[PDB]
């Protein structure tokens, strides 16, 4: 899944990723969306951030001290 997700995120096609990928219903672990959220914030992709938050991502867990200082 990661290759397709990263590709769609890079090209900023919300609909394709939301429908074809995130509708799979397979387990979505925290670290996955942690990495994709970190790469989404830098590239200024707000819609993907909203999609990740909706699909489930503990933002407080994600925002570590290291992440904030690096950002």
């Amino acid at each position: 899944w990661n290759g397709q997700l990263k590709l769609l995120l890079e090209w900023n096609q919300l609909d394709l990723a939301s429908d074809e990928i995130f509708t799979n219903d397979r387990r979505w672990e925290s670290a996955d969306l942690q990495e994709v959220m970190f790469t989404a914030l830098i590239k200024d992709r707000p819609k993907f951030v909203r999609l990740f938050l909706e699909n489930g991502l503990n933002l407080q867990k994600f925002l570590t001290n290291e992440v904030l200082t690096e950002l």
């Binding site: 995130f22 219903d25 397979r26 387990r27 979505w28 909706e54 699909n55 489930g56």
Partner: protein, 67 residues
Amino acid sequence: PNLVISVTGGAKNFALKPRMRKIFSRLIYIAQSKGAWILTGGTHYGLMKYIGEVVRDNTISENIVAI
């Protein structure tokens, strides 16, 4: 007076889609208004946790009972 049975355990992971979210928020509001029961699986992961959080905030906002 009123009972609602929401099927649980179908999906281990639940997507908080606005279409799928506002419906259950309104359902919980209706149950509170009419003092209905809601029956769910009670698992921590999935829709059960969302329903529990909604009930908790509504109680913060007693009259609604979830089993």
